[model samples]
Target: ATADTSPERLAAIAKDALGALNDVILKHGVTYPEYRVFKQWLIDVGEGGEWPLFLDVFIEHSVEEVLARSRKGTMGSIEGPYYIENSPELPSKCTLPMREEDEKITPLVFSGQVTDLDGNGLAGAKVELWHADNDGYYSQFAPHLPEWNLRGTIIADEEGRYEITTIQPAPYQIPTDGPTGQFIEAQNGHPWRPAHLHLIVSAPGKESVTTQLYFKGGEWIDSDVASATKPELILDPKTGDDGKNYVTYNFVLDPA
Candidate 1:
């Protein structure tokens, strides 16, 4: 979380950032009442403890863009705000923990390989995966679900491969009762993100990637409220004979 930015660099960035806000205020001829409301909304966002939600939804993509300038493997996406480290570990080919209710949904068997930029497999790589349930509710985020539902760390085999069985998550709307929602509602914007799987793929000597995979033709794919969707990260799973969706995607990592 530390930037190590020198004071000179920090000052330069802050100056331009403030300058941009001032420019917007001037361009709009912002009035006193509007200014007061804007300040009040800022306070509300803080009071609601939604700075993480608001910034991750509206700003993290731009920060991710900065990292993308130098990446040379699978595209990355926002982590959103719902990741828990050190989940239960499963084998290379395994099913994620889920309740009977979750089993009723169409299962998604996500298989993938972890490789280097040169297309060589990295043995014993790890794929940490977590996503919302079919009902569009994350486990810990909602009160009723089990703590680790739909979350696991899958250890790839010696060939850097894994086949993880989990249900396809549903598109979810951000909490609309909070100030972050107020900001979106004020602009007539929708709060839906496309159904997506969050992942962090890693190995001993390669740079880990924090990314998300979305289903092709998913709702809000082209208009994710978080603006985190990428053309390269969409999965077009084919239905198998067993009535489950299957897709094989590979992750190519850059050197550490």
Candidate 2:
């Protein structure tokens, strides 16, 4: 094994071992007729050697390099899928929409300014927002809710300030029906994700940032699956007089 052998290399090794085992089984000329069925299963799933080519040399040769280059802020998580229904329809104002439910909501007010690396306000910048609700499920992913719940896009004003009102996100468990979840559980780890809000900030002459703002004190902030959590993205919650939650965070975008 190389000194830098990774989980991906181990997966490749396991695949090779399975192929070798199949070759040996075939060479011995099995008398049990059930062996043919097993061989067919391997062929159907593995296709012997017709698997997708690993042409992603960048990922293979420079995994660490790529990660270091792109690991800016709380990005790179394979969390819930966020979608933009009609981005062009978003208003160019700084107002939070109404609530989806009238229950005991924590009226979170997130205010931020979109700025460049030089601290100049990025006027007319588009800030796309989406996140899971209190129950840990997104709108389209949740059956009981309408499409695009708590999902919207806002354009920063001339002063580059934007605000949105929503309920505090509740921590939720990762999907346990997939291999990623199973692997995490097998390692004796909890699949719960920290509460967060997703954002995609885009402006002219500035690089777009697709990242998440995580709550300050969550258990899984440091142990994210995609290894993309950043300490700066962790936000502190501000309590209001009416017992509502509020957070104020600012983001800086680098020049494109």
Candidate 3:
């Protein structure tokens, strides 16, 4: 699922990474017993299937920020470990798949256009959207829900416009029963992530943007456990007369 790393690339990065660990060990005077426990915890994290969760929560933001430095388009965030490709293709204006219970939440109408850096519309763009449900469960991740619940690959219209309708997601804790949660607990940290929508917007000849949009006033916005929030990525949706939350946030893509 990843590209090959050259020997030189591995040598430089791995050497420095291990060197940093060695420095920390020296600074803390880490003992053999502590080292054994740390090694044991690493094994537990792998055995519990939480390496992805652990890495994504603690390390992905730095990697993402490095990619963001050269981009002149919408800001990017970590893809997270939950994304699934090839979700059901939806029209420019369509409702995401959901259960009857999911419809009880406030509907959010996310309308926007995909444009280039110069503000021209980019037709034939695709906006792939996915988010946790009201109970903070993703479709495939939660066995009780349908496979495509709240997930879609939306094809933009001629003007690169789209009006997606979906329920407003709620903030929820990451799986607190796993080793990732145990690691957080050991550090006396909470496991809350703010309500947000994950999106990957792309167009022909343009670099794709993988990002998450957070609710402006959502809980945990100021302190997400994953450290993926950005000020420019918050959305302030206003409720309309019909009681639906509406927000418009355009995507500006850099050329490939």
The candidate maximizing lDDT is 3
* Candidate 3 Cα lDDT to native: 0.95
lDDT of 3 by residue, 20-124 (tens): 999999999999999998999999998998888889999999999999999999999999989999999999999999999998999999999999999999899
Superposed Cα deviation of residue 158, candidate 2 (Å): 1.4
Off by over 4 Å in 2: 1-80, 85-103
Better of 2 and 3 by TM-score: 3
Worst 10 residues of 2 by lDDT: 50-59
The TM-score ranking, best first, is 1, 3, 2
| Alpha-carbon RMSD, candidate 1 | 0.9
TM-scores of the candidates are: 0.98, 0.67, 0.97
- Please give me the total number of clashing residue pairs in predicted model 3: 0
Residue 157 in model 3: lDDT: 97
Instruction: Give the Å error, residue 70, model 3.
Output: 1.8
For each of the candidates, the C-alpha root-mean-square deviation to the true structure, in angstroms, is 0.9, 9.1, 1.0
RMSD of 2: 9.1
- Taking the tens digit of each residue's C-alpha lDDT, what string does model 2 give over 7-107? 99989988998998778878886666757755564464344221221111112223433543754432332223345555333554433333457245676
Q: State residue 160's C-alpha deviation in candidate 2, in Å.
A: 1.4
